[PDB]
Design a protein around this motif. Structure first.
Motif, PDB file in Angstrom:
ATOM      1  N   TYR A  30      -2.286  15.244  35.063  1.00  7.53           N
ATOM      2  CA  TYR A  30      -3.299  14.265  34.738  1.00  7.53           C
ATOM      3  C   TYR A  30      -4.458  14.348  35.714  1.00  7.53           C
ATOM      4  CZ  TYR A  30      -0.052  11.924  31.598  1.00  7.53           C
ATOM      5  OH  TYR A  30       0.760  11.605  30.532  1.00  7.53           O
ATOM      6  N   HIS A  31      -5.697  14.310  35.150  1.00 10.55           N
ATOM      7  CA  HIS A  31      -6.947  14.377  35.917  1.00 10.55           C
ATOM      8  C   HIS A  31      -7.398  12.924  36.159  1.00 10.55           C
ATOM      9  CE1 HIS A  31     -11.494  15.936  36.247  1.00 10.55           C
ATOM     10  NE2 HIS A  31     -10.939  15.719  37.473  1.00 10.55           N
ATOM     11  N   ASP A  32      -7.702  12.671  37.438  1.00  6.74           N
ATOM     12  CA  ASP A  32      -8.409  11.468  37.968  1.00  6.74           C
ATOM     13  C   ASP A  32      -9.805  11.894  38.412  1.00  6.74           C
ATOM     14  OD1 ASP A  32      -9.419   9.292  39.426  1.00  6.74           O
ATOM     15  OD2 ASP A  32      -7.772   9.220  40.873  1.00  6.74           O
ATOM     16  N   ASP A  33     -10.793  11.742  37.479  1.00  5.47           N
ATOM     17  CA  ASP A  33     -12.161  12.218  37.771  1.00  5.47           C
ATOM     18  C   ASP A  33     -12.928  11.000  38.245  1.00  5.47           C
ATOM     19  OD1 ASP A  33     -14.796  13.173  37.509  1.00  5.47           O
ATOM     20  OD2 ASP A  33     -14.471  14.238  35.600  1.00  5.47           O
ATOM     21  N   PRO A  34     -13.637  11.125  39.373  1.00  6.10           N
ATOM     22  CA  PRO A  34     -14.290   9.962  39.966  1.00  6.10           C
ATOM     23  C   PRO A  34     -15.628   9.616  39.179  1.00  6.10           C
ATOM     24  CG  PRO A  34     -14.840  11.939  41.179  1.00  6.10           C
ATOM     25  CD  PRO A  34     -13.655  12.299  40.339  1.00  6.10           C
ATOM     26  N   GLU A  86     -17.679  10.073  34.919  1.00  8.04           N
ATOM     27  CA  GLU A  86     -17.325  10.026  33.510  1.00  8.04           C
ATOM     28  C   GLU A  86     -17.173  11.443  32.936  1.00  8.04           C
ATOM     29  OE1 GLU A  86     -20.607   7.818  31.831  1.00  8.04           O
ATOM     30  OE2 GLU A  86     -19.950   5.915  32.880  1.00  8.04           O
ATOM     31  N   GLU A  87     -16.499  11.607  31.792  1.00  6.53           N
ATOM     32  CA  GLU A  87     -16.413  12.892  31.075  1.00  6.53           C
ATOM     33  C   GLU A  87     -16.784  12.550  29.632  1.00  6.53           C
ATOM     34  OE1 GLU A  87     -12.733  15.143  31.612  1.00  6.53           O
ATOM     35  OE2 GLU A  87     -12.770  14.792  33.785  1.00  6.53           O
ATOM     36  N   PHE A  88     -17.752  13.262  29.145  1.00  3.53           N
ATOM     37  CA  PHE A  88     -18.103  13.202  27.692  1.00  3.53           C
ATOM     38  C   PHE A  88     -17.488  14.335  26.868  1.00  3.53           C
ATOM     39  CE2 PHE A  88     -20.994  15.025  24.425  1.00  3.53           C
ATOM     40  CZ  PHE A  88     -21.081  13.909  23.525  1.00  3.53           C
ATOM     41  N   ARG A  96      -6.719   8.241  33.996  1.00  4.34           N
ATOM     42  CA  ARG A  96      -5.934   9.504  34.124  1.00  4.34           C
ATOM     43  C   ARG A  96      -5.787  10.249  32.704  1.00  4.34           C
ATOM     44  NH1 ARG A  96      -6.600   6.712  38.652  1.00  4.34           N
ATOM     45  NH2 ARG A  96      -5.024   7.033  40.301  1.00  4.34           N
ATOM     46  N   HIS A  97      -6.013  11.591  32.461  1.00 10.68           N
ATOM     47  CA  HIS A  97      -5.983  12.263  31.143  1.00 10.68           C
ATOM     48  C   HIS A  97      -5.421  13.591  31.354  1.00 10.68           C
ATOM     49  CE1 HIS A  97      -9.862  13.169  33.110  1.00 10.68           C
ATOM     50  NE2 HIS A  97      -9.896  14.291  32.464  1.00 10.68           N
ATOM     51  N   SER A  98      -4.644  13.919  30.377  1.00 13.94           N
ATOM     52  CA  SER A  98      -4.054  15.204  30.382  1.00 13.94           C
ATOM     53  C   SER A  98      -4.394  15.761  29.001  1.00 13.94           C
ATOM     54  CB  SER A  98      -2.503  15.011  30.540  1.00 13.94           C
ATOM     55  OG  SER A  98      -1.843  16.267  30.502  1.00 13.94           O
ATOM     56  N   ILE A 101     -18.757  17.444  28.948  1.00 11.84           N
ATOM     57  CA  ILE A 101     -19.852  17.388  29.878  1.00 11.84           C
ATOM     58  C   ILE A 101     -19.395  16.447  31.023  1.00 11.84           C
ATOM     59  CG2 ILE A 101     -22.162  16.676  30.290  1.00 11.84           C
ATOM     60  CD1 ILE A 101     -22.776  17.659  27.279  1.00 11.84           C
ATOM     61  N   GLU A 102     -19.559  16.953  32.278  1.00 10.49           N
ATOM     62  CA  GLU A 102     -19.222  16.234  33.511  1.00 10.49           C
ATOM     63  C   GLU A 102     -20.449  16.395  34.422  1.00 10.49           C
ATOM     64  OE1 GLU A 102     -14.563  17.663  33.257  1.00 10.49           O
ATOM     65  OE2 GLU A 102     -15.511  17.691  35.264  1.00 10.49           O
ATOM     66  N   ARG A 103     -20.386  15.825  35.621  1.00 15.57           N
ATOM     67  CA  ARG A 103     -21.427  15.911  36.632  1.00 15.57           C
ATOM     68  C   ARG A 103     -20.837  16.596  37.859  1.00 15.57           C
ATOM     69  NH1 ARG A 103     -23.134   9.976  38.785  1.00 15.57           N
ATOM     70  NH2 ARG A 103     -23.626  11.673  40.244  1.00 15.57           N
TER      71      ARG A 103
HETATM   72 CU   LIG Z   1     -10.960  15.692  33.458  1.00 15.61          CU
END
Ligand SMILES: [Cu+2]
Ligand SMILES: [Fe+2]
Length: 174
Positions: A50-54, A56-58, A94-96, A109-111
């Motif tokens: 699982y990803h914890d991205d600080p 947003e993810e589009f 959290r997303h897998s 799309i991320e930053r």
């Molecule tokens: Cu992610």
């Protein structure tokens, strides 16, 4: 200048990169060294982290279907990305992602993350649900910064060992 080059036809670019949107590569970043990290992710790919991205993810699932395994409100949930769907994932959820279909294609799309803002990657116990192992990383480049993290998890029963119930997480395939 146009640092990132001219506009270009996206479906044609996805067709031309079809060999990279499948194992073992799976994804391709569109532009390099930009603030917006624009990736097309193909399939098939299943994973257990699982990803914890600080940030947003589009997502815009252009072709085929996929789904995100999530923790929402302390509970296991799934967000389906059916072909044609868009979605915005808030920070830290959290997303897998699971991408069962070959020939699928999702725009993600991320930053870029600033210095000191870290990503987490983590694995949870199939039996009791408790957090098994988390590593925080300053994510500068996916290709060198991320696969050794995952590989070090799969290679260690210690990292894979649930601290609540002692069950040893399976590692790579669920
Ligand atoms: Cu992610
Ligand atoms: Fe457990």
């Amino acid at each position: 200048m146009l640092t990132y080059g001219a506009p270009f036809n996206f479906p044609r670019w996805i067709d031309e990169h079809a060999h990279l949107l499948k194992p073992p590569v799976g994804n391709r970043q569109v532009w390099q060294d930009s603030d917006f990290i624009v990736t097309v992710v193909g399939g098939p790919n299943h994973r257990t982290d699982y990803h914890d991205d600080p940030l947003e993810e589009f997502f815009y699932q252009l072709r085929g279907n996929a789904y995100l395994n999530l923790w929402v409100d302390g509970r296991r949930e799934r967000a389906d990305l059916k072909e044609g769907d868009i979605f915005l994932l808030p920070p830290h959820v959290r997303h897998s992602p699971q991408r069962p279909e070959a020939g699928s294609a999702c725009l993600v799309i991320e930053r870029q993350r600033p210095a000191g803002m870290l990503d987490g990657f983590e694995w949870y116990c199939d039996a009791c649900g408790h957090l098994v192992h988390r590593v925080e990383v300053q994510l500068k480049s996916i290709v060198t910064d991320l696969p050794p993290l995952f590989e070090s998890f799969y290679a260690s029963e210690d990292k894979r060992r649930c601290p609540h119930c002692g069950q040893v997480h399976p590692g790579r395939a669920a």
